[PDB]
């Protein structure tokens, strides 16, 4: 007999949290929530950047409630720190599905969409593509003005559950973003 | 991506070598052709639209491709095709400025062969669209730049076939 | 993921069994070691950085690995490597608290062997980095916890090889 | 082919062919159109399959591209991928015919003796072929990927 | 380079290079031979430069080379000058590229984390670099010394 673990897990609903923020509500709570934005959006699997890219003035804008979580996420999407590390090295087709996931938690839906975003990256560039998503109906209903985005595994579109399982939490990020000094590969071993 | 100059720097960095005579000679061979690359890019950019129109006219339209059953039938697909053409032209202009084809691999060729197989996009017909734009480009840019522009169009087209 | 308390429940649920004597004995065997797991985690967490430093010093740096041509050459890659090391240490600490290796499979090992093959990351050298952190950990946590911490480092390292 | 194999067994017995053998031929004819299509698909991506096979190989066995390795150096590596290109070609031939036949005569009978002379490590050639299976198989539908996979595993088998 | 930087901004906005971007490529390439001469001179005196930096460093911070110092001892000092040799090399790369892309990926991004682990005092590495500026700059004409100096002050800046 199959256990509770056998179908669609049980370890993934536990692992998905919804963080909101509560304007008048503690630094620590703010921090963890803020840290999760970084983890979902720029991959950061260890969940925090060695005081990197980050958000000087970005953090004060999000807290203060000057900016709302949706907005902060949109700023984060169009930035140098992001362009380099996810669009610096990829033809026009896998960068689109990667921009999709981080911000919609998935892969491209159908062949008709490999068109809407490829033409927006075609002509208006990366910044416009980021905005196209943060403002779509799908983004809005699911995480609206203030839910930090999370991984999804959604059931519905057909084929999308298995694609989603594969794009996120099954196949990680390869390829070093920078092109500066290739890794040589003839030396697996550390004998001494 | 990398250009002529960073191609050399990264090749030496992995050996941890300061640039030596052989390296310095390569970089000179790039710098000495640099002004000509710039002039050529300004011709291509400013004639972009005319190059696509003359390349399509010689190699794509007035054909079964643009007729019902053809892949560039429908205003939708005709638009997608000449959109693509603009990508090729524009990126080849980047490759030629950089003096390195690496950008054509990273941002254009990777997965494109199979993408075209999956949509049904005719590969051989697309290559002719590339080699027709090269033909036009080589006239417009002149003796100075003709060979140098040409190679990155040829890089593109053997990348698909 | 699952832990010793949770695993006992899901292992019985699939058989639709109440927890019986055999189950209750297993859970006791976990609870009875629980306080020691907590103390050990507090030592590892608070010495995290020193464990990585001493493990790298015994098993990675002062070598061809850190020299030009080596995979942990460049500040970029050196940073990525000790970043990885922190993951291993941190997750092994989770596995040991949970008393179950399932988290090491779900969130660390799955696809990692091939990821390292694809980037060129030296597997054997990474295992030594794991088994050096274990060595340090086993000193710091003491008789109480040494064997229990150790196994999840050994789980990690036979997961790559 | 399937034809050659059936016939040779028929003639050896000196009697016309009989219902079964015939059934296999009929299956092969229907299969051949699909088989021809798979070979064409494999042929289209040959350069990508070889190159990515070659990376997958040298990670898994870096020793062949090392001081005392058969494929050590730029032109000892160039010939190595060329041999990988040879075997992918033979795999397309095998698929199309429906029987392995010609590939055997072209590239396994005598292969031990050839590579022993050159001192090439045979089992790492078998690995290069597994690596090609992995790449080629990711460009084919489930059903066609299996049909192709049998011929890859044969070559892997014969180098043994 | 200047090329890489210009292009990346071009491609990211889906456009051809600006008049500005074209102008800087032109001014940059005109300074090619000069930049190559600046790198040559410094490459030619590398062994002298690191040491004079190394003397200037140990006077200013005799402690680093003291009981509880990161560079205390003969081989903890040998590695320290080797790191100074590394950064001078990267400075020659930067000068010929006309920007920091290469300098940055190779030796500043991740440098805080590396040296914090080794427990190396970062600000005294910045001093070692100032010391190299002083020596290198005394082997170059006024105009070339300034052009070089920008790249030294960048590294000093990034370790901060």
């Amino acid at each position: 007999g199959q256990s509770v673990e056998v179908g669609v897990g049980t370890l993934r609903r536990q692992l998905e949290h919804i963080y909101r923020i509560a304007p008048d509500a503690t630094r620590s709570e703010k921090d963890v929530a803020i840290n999760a934005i970084y983890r979902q959006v720029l991959d950061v699997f260890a969940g925090i950047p060695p005081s990197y890219l980050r958000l000087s003035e970005a953090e004060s804008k999000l807290k203060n409630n000057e900016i709302s979580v949706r907005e902060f996420v949109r700023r984060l999407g169009r930035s140098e720190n992001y362009r380099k590390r996810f669009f610096e090295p990829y033809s026009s087709p896998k960068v689109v599905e990667l921009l999709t996931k981080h911000f919609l938690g998935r892969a491209p839906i159908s062949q008709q969409e490999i068109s809407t975003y490829v033409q927006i990256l075609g002509t208006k560039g990366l910044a416009a593509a980021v905005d196209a998503i943060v403002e779509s109906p799908e983004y809005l209903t699911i995480f609206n003005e203030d839910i930090v985005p999370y991984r999804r595994y959604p059931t519905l579109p057909a084929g999308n559950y298995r694609a989603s399982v594969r794009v996120n939490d099954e196949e990680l990020i390869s390829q070093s973003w920078s092109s500066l000094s290739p890794t040589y590969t003839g030396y697996q071993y550390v004998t001494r | 991506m990398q250009d002529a100059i960073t191609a050399v720097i990264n090749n030496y960095d992995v050996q941890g070598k300061y640039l030596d005579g052989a390296a310095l000679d390569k970089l000179k061979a790039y710098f000495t052709t640099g002004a000509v690359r710039v002039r050529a890019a300004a011709v291509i950019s400013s004639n972009a639209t005319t190059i696509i129109k003359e390349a399509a006219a010689k190699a794509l339209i007035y054909s079964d491709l643009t007729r019902p059953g053809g892949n560039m039938y429908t205003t939708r697909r005709y638009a997608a095709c000449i959109r693509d053409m603009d990508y090729f032209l524009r990126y080849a202009t980047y490759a030629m400025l950089a003096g390195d084809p690496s950008i054509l691999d990273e941002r254009v060729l990777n997965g494109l062969k199979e993408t075209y197989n999956s949509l049904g996009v005719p590969i051989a017909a697309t290559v002719g669209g590339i080699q027709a734009m090269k033909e036009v480009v080589g006239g417009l840019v002149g003796p100075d730049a003709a060979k140098e522009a040409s190679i990155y169009f040829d890089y593109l087209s053997s990348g698909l076939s | 993921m699952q832990d010793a308390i949770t695993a006992v429940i899901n292992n019985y649920d699939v058989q639709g069994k109440y927890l019986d004597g055999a189950a209750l004995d297993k859970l006791k065997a976990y609870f009875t070691t629980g306080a020691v797991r907590v103390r050990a985690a507090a030592v590892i967490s608070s010495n995290a950085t020193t464990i990585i430093k001493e493990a790298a010093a015994k098993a990675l740096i002062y070598s061809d690995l850190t020299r030009p041509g080596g995979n942990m050459y460049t500040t970029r890659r050196y940073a990525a490597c000790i970043r990885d090391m922190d993951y291993f240490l941190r997750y092994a600490t989770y596995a040991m608290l949970a008393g179950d290796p399932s988290i090491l499979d779900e969130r660390v090992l799955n696809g990692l062997k091939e990821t390292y093959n694809s980037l060129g990351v030296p597997i054997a050298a990474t295992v030594g980095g794991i088994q050096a952190m274990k060595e340090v950990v086993g000193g710091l946590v003491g008789p109480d916890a040494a064997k229990e911490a150790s196994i999840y480092f050994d789980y990690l390292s036979s997961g790559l090889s | 082919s399937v034809l050659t194999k059936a016939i040779v067994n028929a003639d050896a017995e000196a009697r016309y062919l009989s219902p079964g053998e015939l059934d296999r031929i009929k299956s092969f004819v229907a299969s051949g159109e699909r088989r021809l299509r798979i070979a064409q698909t494999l042929t289209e991506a040959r350069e990508r399959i070889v190159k990515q096979a070659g990376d997958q190989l040298f990670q898994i066995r870096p020793d062949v591209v090392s001081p005392g390795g058969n494929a050590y150096g730029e032109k000892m590596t160039a010939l190595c991928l060329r041999d990988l290109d040879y075997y992918l070609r033979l795999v397309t031939y095998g698929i199309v015919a429906g029987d392995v036949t010609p590939i055997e005569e072209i590239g396994i009978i005598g292969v031990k003796e050839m590579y022993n002379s050159l001192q090439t490590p045979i089992p790492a050639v078998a690995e290069g072929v597994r690596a090609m299976k992995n790449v080629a198989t990711s460009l084919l539908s489930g059903d066609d990927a299996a049909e192709a996979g049998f011929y890859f595993d044969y070559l892997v088998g014969a180098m043994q | 380079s200047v090329l890489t930087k210009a292009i990346v901004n071009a491609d990211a906005e889906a456009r051809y290079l600006s008049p500005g971007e074209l102008d800087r490529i032109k001014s940059f390439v005109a300074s090619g031979e000069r930049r190559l001469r600046i790198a040559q001179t410094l490459t030619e005196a590398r062994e002298r430069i690191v040491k004079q930096a190394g003397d200037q460093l140990f006077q200013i911070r005799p402690d680093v080379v003291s009981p509880g110092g990161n560079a205390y001892g003969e081989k903890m000092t040998a590695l320290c000058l080797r790191d100074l040799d590394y950064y001078l090399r990267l400075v020659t790369y930067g000068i010929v590229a006309g920007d920091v892309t290469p300098i940055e990926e190779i030796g500043i991004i991740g440098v805080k984390e590396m040296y914090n682990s080794l427990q190396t005092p970062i600000p005294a590495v910045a001093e070692g670099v100032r010391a190299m500026k002083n020596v290198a700059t005394s082997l170059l004409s006024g105009d070339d010394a300034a052009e070089a100096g920008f790249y030294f002050d960048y590294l000093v800046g990034a370790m901060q």
Partner: peptide, 30 residues
């Protein structure tokens, strides 16, 4: 001939089969 296979010296975004020829080794000197 082996000309098609030859431009495979470019390897990947950054994949070179092992060991980058002569490599300076300055540790003795330091």
């Amino acid at each position: 001939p082996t000309a098609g296979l030859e431009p495979f010296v470019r390897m990947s975004r950054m994949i070179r089969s092992g060991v980058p020829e002569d490599r300076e080794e300055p540790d003795e000197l330091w």
